[PDB]
Paper text:
The first gene encodes the nucleoprotein (N protein) which associates with the viral genomic and antigenomic RNAs to form the helical [name]. The paramyxoviral [name] assembly entirely covers the viral genome, protecting it from detection and degradation by host factors and serving as the template for viral mRNA transcription and genome replication. Here, we determined the [name] structure of the recombinantly expressed, full-length, and tag-free HeV N protein in complex with [name] host-derived RNA. Following [name] data collection, a multimeric HeV N protein double-ring assembly was resolved to 3.5 Å resolution, enabling the building and refinement of an atomic HeV N protein model.
Subsequent 3D refinement of a curated particle stack comprising 5638 particles and using D14 symmetry resulted in a 3.5 Å resolution [name] density map, revealing a previously uncharacterised multimeric nucleoprotein assembly. In the HeV N protein assembly two rings stack ‘bottom-to-bottom’, where the globular N-terminal domains (NTDs) intercalate to form a dimer of tetradecamers. Each tetradecameric ring has a diameter of approximately 20 nm and is topped with the C-terminal arms (Ct-arms) which cover parts of the globular C terminal domains (CTDs). The double ring assembly is approximately 12.5 nm tall, and each ring has an aperture formed by the Ct-arms that is approximately 7 nm wide. The HeV N protein double-ring assembly is formed through extensive lateral interactions in each tetradecameric ring as well as intercalating interactions between two tetradecameric rings. A defining feature of this HeV N protein double-ring assembly is the gear-wheel interface between the two tetradecameric rings. This intercalation zone consists solely of residues in the NTDs of N protomers in the top ring and N protomers in the bottom ring (indicated by the lower-case n). The Ni protomer contacts two protomers in the bottom ring (ni and ni+1), with a total calculated buried surface area of ~ 545 Å2. A clear, reciprocal hydrogen-bonding interface exists between Ni and ni+1 with the residues Lys120, Glu123, and Glu124 where the two Glu residues in Ni form a tab that interacts with the Lys residue in ni+1 and vice versa.
Residue numbers in the entry:
A (entry chain E), B (entry chain D), C (entry chain k), D (entry chain j): 1 to 394
Write the structure that this text describes.
């Protein structure tokens, strides 16, 4: 009777947030791996420039261990800050790893540890020399930068270093947008992002890394979750307004605009196209279940918190509930109207196992062949009967 | 049901202001670069005239470092004030740079540091001499001013110095309007502004800088963000009324009238044309999402603060959300109606990848062929059917 | 009549806090002197030990400029902290000076500037070498430490560095107690404090500086006010409880226990002895003005704030109002009763020009020959006449 | 007038808690030293017994570094717990040190690190072998235990290990009572404490360490504050009732009864004897100041918190304010009645510089020659006039 179809509505609402309450224990604590991070101790551009040159080689090195590669990645990302050690320690929320910050101090060809020389320090120098030699020999004499003069370049002015660093930072931060969603299909939007900043003159194109190095970094960025967690944490903190933003921060925040809501196009297309833009083909006894599920997802997205846009980047388990497959019918209808309306929408890969072409066809007919679709009019257009016809004539 | 399409609206409203709350930390602190600014210590007209000539030469110089160019620009912008050091120190909000104000004191051909002569001073003296020599040799003997007599001109009267400084400041401040939006397509609106100010006799046309120097300064202004931030801060402070305004301040505010809302013609054109000028073609079930996004953008713009008009100049990350691309349909409709209505609108470059020519055609038709479009009439026009027919006859 | 003698009291109360209200302007801004501070960039024990040895040499140097000596003192005082630059920048309230923090980086025999070598660095290196040579040649080959082996000592263990640094900091901090009150009459209380800390095993006696270096450092500390202000700020910050205190902080607070209320023995002795310890000779119609002045001074001391005990160290102008001379009669009475009562009091130098020997004699008599002086008894001692007689018998 | 002597009472009360408010900053952060702690990973008695044998030798070793000695001390104290690593990490509040817990795993003659053998592990084995060889050679073949059979004893039963460990724990925990107050004058109460537990059969006397080893441990315990802080933290946590107490915990809590209020006998004797046991010789114009100061100290002691009894052990700077010297007169009177009443009181060393024998003599007369001292009688003893005489006759 009347109680039925309302008990279920509460039942489905209760089922979604079934056991996601309370606080977990410390027994389920992941084993931690030591990660050695080489941060610049001083503000001298000559040491900082030599440091970021070293961090570039470690990432490009094929003989480098993964833990060393994460250290180079953490060294690069925090290079812009005046106190990289403080930034890493105050913006790290990775239970998987423990970070041991190492102040570099001075600069040899590699890094001088300068701590009880001879005692457990000599082998580290030999290891780093092997890292540098293998990195340079691995490539065909090709420097990480697209310009061979940008590698063996002497930097002493603070102004040049800041411009040089930001270009390295910006090019790395470009990859996060499509590092885990479709890393192979990248280099098109990434080039478009780089071209945009070049025209804005925010980045000096002289310090442009080659695509060989970018592929190596992107492979590192996809494999490792700790680096992704650190960069997502930076994005959220930078997103919070209130303080003055520097040139490095403004670029990061601008890049974070493209990063948000990545990897969840199937869910958001359903919200924007299938659900909104109210079409008379919604209530058809095959979307009422999906509409109920979608309503629960909106509450779940609001309940998650500030990490909701970057769910795919952090690989949250909540993401699977958001993916199409739990509401294949409405999503199929949503992609039907999406391809017809949005020209860009159509390069999306939607060859899933629950396409349901009949509902896809209905969405295609909904955009054009269904009706003009005049919604509630606050302004009273009594003579708009022909106005719809002219609009419908197209 | 009824809850749907309102839950979704609240969801989009919450998603717009998702994580832009709270206060950030000091860990994300940009590295600062020292910027040396040469300000006049006294009010003697000859010293100030020599100082602004030196600043012009340094800006024109090709061998000048970028920091020196920024120092020269800051010296120029604050020349009108009787206390340039106080003006710079009390109107600087640039975390990227730290300004070390230097009182010039006396004046040689260059500038006498007058601080422990021989100790760390002769090198700076020879550097400034090299700067001046390279600046003079670089051009084909052409002075920065369009009149060769305006360069080697002796100034001893305060009024003449004030007039020349006002002209130089005005000619500098014309460039900010189209320095980052379309610097290449400039020199038309800039020439129009210069002609307008000449016809108003606010600027003496004798001190007119050549177009080569103007191009060099526009390139410098586009490259650097600190100068843009300082000039935007000056514009914001001058805009606040309450006190007496001098000739320099009046000219600066008149220029800032044109400066405001630059680089956001898409959003404001969308508002003014698509949103206002209520057309029966608005409520069409394909514009509701765009209207909701536009409303959220309106609240965001109100929330941003006094820096909202100058977001493109400061390169705020919030600007990307304002750009068309999140509402291409309504934007295309508004561009169509604007191009049909506003004759000047049509020189705008709108060859984007989301043009949607169908909606552009729909807007073009809605502008003219749609109907007369009589809105709510407070005055009762009983017999205005024939008036509407005659108006539609055109 | 009745109103008079109360109008006078209100008049004196208003006169005490006559013009000490409102906020001052920025026009009265002292000229600032640049002070170069060499702080350790890293946590390596060898670098910190070499840095503190260099600071000791610079302080002992006779050819050192005063600014260099202040920089060395600031380097020494902040050596215990893991981030000396942050400690100095966040605990500096000196309008007289501006501090330019310099991260040392690596360390040669002196300090490597490591910033554009050859450009304005070689002269500083030669100056530092001259400073070291003059410091070493000035004494008769006598190292700053009382043990010649403590100077040319290699430090690589963190614990040894911490112990040596704590000892040096403690020996420095002993001097502040009697640096400006009576620097010449020192070396007795200072030696007592050093012996106390040695017997407590808080300080390793191996790193004990010679008395020549201690005299030089005490002279430097008395001459300079910025160092005193910095150390008083450190004392005030450490005094505020709430957080865990390290060995250095505990030693500093224990020394500040002796530091407090220094140089104001006259006022506090007057309070404790003349005002408290109620004697029948107090209300005698020659002490009412002094009592009113003392009450006003107590109100002023409560009004001053947390800087009240260290008024002599900061050389506050309000201190002169606290000194005896505005209440010579009650002060003399209190010093008489103190010299008769307190055995230790009597080594104080009170050969002032307002001794008033009659009141000193009156206080001496009031201490012993006056009466037993039984005050208000909560317990009813009805048979205490014989007890009072026996007590007066002595 | 009446306001005077009440303004001072508030003034002295306000002066005590002058600047002890608010929260300190993190700038004053002590440099941390790494401390390596060898904890047993498993519960096997054979490994635990071999571990505590190793920790005994390290403490006895003369060639051992201080940091190693602290690690042995931390290893011993936490040996009773089933999870020594959890106990140390959850009961450590030492900002001076950082503890790196090392699970021992298996057991060779020394300790097998078992982590990448050959890589930075071989030298550690050689160092430990040097530690063991020097420790055994330093003594004249004397084992740490008073019984030579207790050293080379095989332990496989859990029951024997628990009894053996507790004896080692109890003997170490005896020293804390008089480790910093008067370490030289120890071995009398310490032997008395040990004899008491032997008669109670809580400790098996077979595992009794020689006095040569106890002196070495006590010297370590006095020098190092980190060990004292850890053991004080254990005392407070064990003091908090609510849970079941094991044999190890019960001994520690029983020992903590003697540890409490150590090193503050001068203050507490004044409270118990001078202030309490109300004598008609209190109000004499020479104790009113001391009574006021004593009252302020009681509030300060209550304000400190649970760490108030162990102020001397933690070497809190607040302790100096509690020491006699700020109230020498009443303390001298208090010790006067203390020596006459308490036979044990009189072995205390009170040869200070502020003895004031006249007030000491008055205290001596106060106990016996002053009066019987009949206080307020709730029971009405009308015929007690002769009862006092018989009591006074003695």
């Amino acid at each position: 009777m009347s109680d039925i179809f309302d008990e279920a509505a509460s039942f489905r609402s209760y089922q979604s947030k079934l056991g996601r309450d309370g606080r977990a224990s410390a027994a389920t604590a992941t084993l931690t791996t030591k990660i050695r991070i080489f941060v610049p101790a001083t503000n001298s551009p000559e040491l900082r420039w030599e440091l970021t040159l070293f961090a570039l080689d470690v990432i490009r090195s094929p003989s480098a261990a993964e833990s060393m590669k994460i250290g180079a990645a953490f060294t690069l990302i925090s290079m812009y800050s005046e106190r990289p050690g403080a930034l890493i320690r105050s913006l790290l929320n990775d239970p998987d790893i423990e970070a041991v910050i190492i102040d570099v101090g001075s600069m040899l060809n590699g890094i001088p540890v300068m701590e009880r020389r001879g005692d457990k320090a000599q082998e580290e120098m030999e290891g780093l020399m092997r890292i540098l030699k293998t990195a340079r020999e691995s490539s065909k004499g090709k420097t990480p930068f697209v310009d061979s003069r940008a590698y063996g370049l002497r930097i002493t002015d603070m102004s040049t270093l800041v411009s040089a660093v930001i270009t390295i930072e910006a090019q790395i931060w470009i990859l996060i947008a499509k590092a885990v969603t479709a890393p192979d299909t990248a280099e098109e939007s990434e080039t478009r992002r780089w071209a945009k900043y070049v025209q804005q003159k925010r980045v000096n194109p002289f310090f442009a890394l080659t695509q060989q190095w970018l592929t190596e970094m992107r492979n590192l960025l996809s494999q490792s979750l700790s680096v992704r967690k650190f960069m997502v944490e930076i994005l959220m903190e930078v997103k919070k307004g209130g303080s003055a933003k520097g040139r490095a921060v403004e670029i990061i925040s601008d890049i974070g605009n493209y990063v948000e809501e990545t990897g969840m196009a199937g869910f958001f297309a359903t919200i924007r196209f299938g659900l909104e833009t109210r079409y008379p083909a919604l209530a058809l006894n095959e979307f009422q279940s999906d509409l109920n599920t979608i309503k629960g997802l909106m509450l779940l997205y609001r309940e998650i918190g500030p990490r909701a846009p970057y769910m795919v980047l952090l690989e949250e388990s909540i993401q699977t509930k958001f993916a199409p497959g739990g509401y294949p019918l409405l999503w199929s209808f949503a992609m039907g109207v999406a391809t017809t309306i949005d020209r860009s929408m159509g390069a999306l890969n939607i060859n899933r196992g629950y396409l349901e072409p009949m509902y896809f066809r209905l969405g295609q007919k909904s955009a054009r062949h269904h009706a003009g679709g005049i919604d509630q009019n606050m302004a009273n257009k009594l003579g708009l009967n022909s106005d719809q016809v002219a609009e419908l004539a197209a």
